[PDB]
């Protein structure tokens, strides 16, 4: 299924699991109900994978490239790192397919609590426009992720608070409107 839990309030290293024992799991249905989508895919065949190309069609993901997140490959690693884990939203959907390595994507639930989602090689997610999230690598310190977008991309992150944007209002309507 998926590896996801309500993460702890603990401060300290973000790249740690922040996964309390005992703790409450999180499933697919719950994430779906938050507008979040998920897929498992053959990460070796990505360069010519029908399933990937089917999803892209169905979702008009016309745009794609790859980011390799690690100290020696990504320029301004430490700054970029800090930016990702800042809580923010987007005015469009955020689509990552992890091709290699792994990391965590946290989102807030219907009661504004942090959910942590562990993403591995082969895992793909979509975080709907308007959802407050953040991202961090785990202690392996490496994530390679195909980024996807509907047409030409706009990367802008608006940190929290950003509750005035229409995308934010639309998403919060969507939650109440189940
Ligand atoms: C340069 S901030 C980019 C935000 C990105 N979608 C993330 O959640 O990590
Ligand atoms: Cl990014
Ligand atoms: Cl650097
Ligand atoms: Fe983001």
From Swiss-Prot:
- TM annotation in the entry: none
The record ties this protein, via InterPro entries, to: ARD (IPR004313), ARD_euk (IPR027496), RmlC-like_jellyroll (IPR014710), RmlC_Cupin_sf (IPR011051)
Catalytic activity entry: 1,2-dihydroxy-5-(methylsulfanyl)pent-1-en-3-one + O2 = 4-methylsulfanyl-2-oxobutanoate + formate + 2 H(+); 1,2-dihydroxy-5-(methylsulfanyl)pent-1-en-3-one + O2 = 3-(methylsulfanyl)propanoate + CO + formate + 2 H(+)
Q: State the SUPFAM superfamilies in the record.
A: RmlC-like cupins
Q: Where is this region: Disordered?
A: 7-26
Where does this polypeptide localize?
A: Cytoplasm; Nucleus; Cell membrane
Q: Where does Ni(2+) bind?
A: 88, 90, 94, 133
Q: Which UniProt keywords apply?
A: Amino-acid biosynthesis, Cell membrane, Cytoplasm, Dioxygenase, Iron, Membrane, Metal-binding, Methionine biosynthesis, Nickel, Nucleus, Oxidoreductase
EC code: 1.13.11.54, 1.13.11.53
GO function terms (MF aspect): acireductone dioxygenase (Ni2+-requiring) activity; acireductone dioxygenase [iron(II)-requiring] activity; iron ion binding; nickel cation binding; oxidoreductase activity
Short name of any one Pfam family annotated for the protein = ARD
Recorded metabolic or biological pathway in which this protein acts: Amino-acid biosynthesis; L-methionine biosynthesis via salvage pathway; L-methionine from S-methyl-5-thio-alpha-D-ribose 1-phosphate: step 5/6
**Which membrane topology describes this protein?**
Peripheral membrane protein
Top-level division of the source organism's lineage: Eukaryota
Q: Which GO terms describe its cellular component?
A: cytoplasm; cytosol; nucleus; plasma membrane
User: Which first-to-last residue range defines the signal peptide?
Assistant: none
| Cofactors required | Fe(2+); Ni(2+)
Residues reported to bind Fe(2+): 88, 90, 94, 133
In which tissues has expression of this protein been reported?
A: Detected in heart, colon, lung, stomach, brain, spleen, liver, skeletal muscle and kidney.
Q: Name one GO biological process term.
A: methionine metabolic process
Q: How is the cofactor bound?
A: Binds either 1 Fe or Ni cation per monomer. Iron-binding promotes an acireductone dioxygenase reaction producing 2-keto-4-methylthiobutyrate, while nickel-binding promotes an acireductone dioxygenase reaction producing 3-(methylsulfanyl)propanoate.
Quote the function comment for this protein. Catalyzes 2 different reactions between oxygen and the acireductone 1,2-dihydroxy-3-keto-5-methylthiopentene (DHK-MTPene) depending upon the metal bound in the active site. Fe-containing acireductone dioxygenase (Fe-ARD) produces formate and 2-keto-4-methylthiobutyrate (KMTB), the alpha-ketoacid precursor of methionine in the methionine recycle pathway. Ni-containing acireductone dioxygenase (Ni-ARD) produces methylthiopropionate, carbon monoxide and formate, and does not lie on the methionine recycle pathway. Also down-regulates cell migration mediated by MMP14.
Q: How does it assemble?
A: Monomer. Interacts with MMP14.
Q: What PANTHER family does this protein's entry cite?
A: ACIREDUCTONE DIOXYGENASE (PTHR23418:SF0)
Q: Which family does it belong to?
A: Belongs to the acireductone dioxygenase (ARD) family.
Protein's recorded name: Acireductone dioxygenase
User: Origin organism of this chain?
Assistant: Homo sapiens
Q: Its gene?
A: ADI1
